[PDB]
Amino acid sequence: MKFIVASGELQKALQTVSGVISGSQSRPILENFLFELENDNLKITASDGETTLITSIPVKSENNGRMAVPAKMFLDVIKSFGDQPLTFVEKESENGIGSLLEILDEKDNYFVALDNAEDYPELPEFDASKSVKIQAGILSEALVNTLFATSNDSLRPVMTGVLFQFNENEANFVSTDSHRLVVYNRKDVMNVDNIEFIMPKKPLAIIKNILSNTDDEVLIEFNENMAKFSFQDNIWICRLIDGKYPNYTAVIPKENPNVLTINRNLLLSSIRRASIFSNKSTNQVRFKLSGNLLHLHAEDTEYANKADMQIPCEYNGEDINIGFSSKFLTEMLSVLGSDDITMKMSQPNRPGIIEPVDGLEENESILMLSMPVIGLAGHHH
């Protein structure tokens, strides 16, 4: 097969599908891009066996073909060029058992050895039974809010992923670990098909880098156990996590009369400083709230360091003494971008509910629950 394509267009297409190639040589055929050339359309596929990324670009050609091109090398090769048309010709090695990909650029020649394309598996016929639509910019903000930066909990399978709930009234995006619950809600995302599914983290991270922040629609189609995203000339296919996500709404305390209103960056930077003085193993801080004063306390009995900070705030509520793991709390505060947050509390053994004060669009809301540190004897019952 032979085709001519602008190197910039080729690089962008290759870069889009490359995030799923892990460098693993356990299935060596999956270290390749799969090129499929048909009627001036170059379809490029990469996969790790569970996530598959596909894109296509127009090219100039007169013939068809299929090629398995080693991905890391070939992308490095394309990256080494400026913007110029490149010619690609598959040649059978004059001495060998397989075939070469030759690149022609003026008087210069390059050869990249190819794998056996017949060994690159075909994807199965996707038989969509349901589909939803969501704008790319909305989906990417959902991923900004639900994908945690740290995740060192060994959770059960349904909670290791992100829940997507779509119905005719709204969409919900939910994630959790032992310290946090994020519920992100869009009442402006409405679909006839009611569907619920759990997306694993790795394809979500891969998709997050590919998604643009635009009003362009993403189609998501579903079969037995896969989701198929379609966005411009891209297709992303992911294995879903089987099972039923817990009834997360039942965990949200109904009454939270103790409302802290505070500048977000002040609370975030204060906790970060205080936790430097706590025990390196647990990184906990205590909140003592009373009047319009937040008293932060951290100490490390092993090393004799201590922090005591008084932070002015708006607090209408009863005196409360409540402890938190600072790393998980500050990560959530870093995800919000508002000037002010509220943290609504009830008892020291119940989660605090963090919400932005400002900065939400009309039909957008987010709820961030932070589970406090509580001795087991004082658990809710």
Min CB(162)–Na ion separation in Å? 36
The set of residues, in sequence order, having a beta carbon less than 8 Å from that of 18 and lying 6+ positions away, is 33, 46, 71, 75
Which residue intervals of the chain are DSSP H helices?
A: 7-17, 71-79, 136-146, 201-210, 264-276, 326-335
Min CB(119)–Na ion separation in Å? 12
Q: Which does 66 bind (CB under 5 to 8 A by kind): Ca ion, a second copy, Na ion, none?
A: Na ion
Q: According to the annotation, is 364 in a ligand binding site?
A: yes
Please give the residue ranges that form the binding site for Na ion (CB under 5 A).
65-66
Q: Give the type of residue at 273.
A: R
| Residue 355 in tokens | 């919400």
Answer yes or no whether residue 267 interacts with a second copy by CB under 8 A: no
Answer yes or no whether residue 338 interacts with Ca ion by CB under 5 A: no
Contact call for residues 58 and 49 (beta carbons, < 8 A): no
Cα atoms in the 13 Å half-sphere on the side-chain side of 379: 3
Min CB(195)–a second copy separation in Å? 19
- Nearest by Cα to 228 from 255, 250, 199: 199
Answer yes or no whether residue 265 interacts with Ca ion by CB under 5 A: no
Answer yes or no whether residue 40 interacts with Ca ion by CB under 5 A: yes
Q: Give the type of residue at 251.
A: V
3-state secondary structure of 64: coil
Query: Interaction with a second copy in 330-349: which residues (CB under 8 A)?
Result: 348
Contact call for residues 354 and 333 (beta carbons, < 8 A): yes
Exposure string of 113-139, with b = 16+ CB inside 10 Å and e = fewer, is ebbebeebeeeeeeeeeebbebbbebb
Answer yes or no whether residue 6 interacts with a second copy by CB under 8 A: no
Tallying the residues shown for the chain, one arrives at 381
| Of positions 245, 315, 340, 345, contacts a second copy by CB under 8 A | 245
Min CB(103)–a second copy separation in Å? 9
Answer yes or no whether residue 177 interacts with a second copy by CB under 8 A: yes
Min CB(155)–Cl ion separation in Å? 4
Q: Which does 76 bind (CB under 5 to 8 A by kind): Ca ion, a second copy, Na ion, none?
A: a second copy
| Residue 62 in tokens | 């007169």
Whole-angstrom distance, CA of residue 169 vs CA of residue 254? 22
Answer yes or no whether residue 155 interacts with Cl ion by CB under 5 A: yes
Q: According to the annotation, is 62 in a ligand binding site?
A: yes
Compare residues 215 and 375 and give the one whose CB is closer to a second copy: 375
Q: Of 148-156, 200-208, 225-233, 352-360, which segment contacts Cl ion by CB under 5 A?
A: 148-156
Answer yes or no whether residue 243 interacts with a second copy by CB under 8 A: yes
Min CB(7)–Na ion separation in Å? 22
Rounded to whole angstroms, what are the CA distances from 346 to 7, 254, 333, 350? 59, 9, 19, 7
Answer yes or no whether residue 304 interacts with a second copy by CB under 8 A: yes
Rounded to whole angstroms, what are the CA distances from 142 to 73, 91, 213, 338? 34, 46, 11, 16
Q: Of 8-16, 170-178, 334-342, 358-366, which segment contacts a second copy by CB under 8 A?
A: 170-178
Q: According to the annotation, is 361 in a ligand binding site?
A: yes
Q: Which does 290 bind (CB under 5 to 8 A by kind): Cl ion, Na ion, a second copy, none?
A: none
Concatenate the DSSP letters of all residues of 190-213 into one string. Answer: --SS-EEEEE-HHHHHHHHHH--S
| Of positions 159, 210, 227, 369, contacts Cl ion by CB under 5 A | 159
Whole-angstrom distance, CA of residue 174 vs CA of residue 184? 6
Q: Of 3-11, 53-61, 141-149, 156-164, which segment contacts a second copy by CB under 8 A?
A: 156-164
| Of positions 15, 151, 165, 167, contacts a second copy by CB under 8 A | 151
Query: Interaction with a second copy in 199-238: which residues (CB under 8 A)?
Result: 202, 225-226
Q: Of 33-41, 209-217, 330-338, 366-374, which segment contacts a second copy by CB under 8 A?
A: 366-374
| Residue 113 in tokens | 């050895």
Q: According to the annotation, is 31 in a ligand binding site?
A: no
| Of positions 273, 338, 355, 360, contacts a second copy by CB under 8 A | 273
List binding-site positions for Ca(2+). 11, 40, 61-62, 141, 168, 194, 361, 364
Residues engaged in binding Cl ion (CB under 5 A): 155-156, 159, 374-375
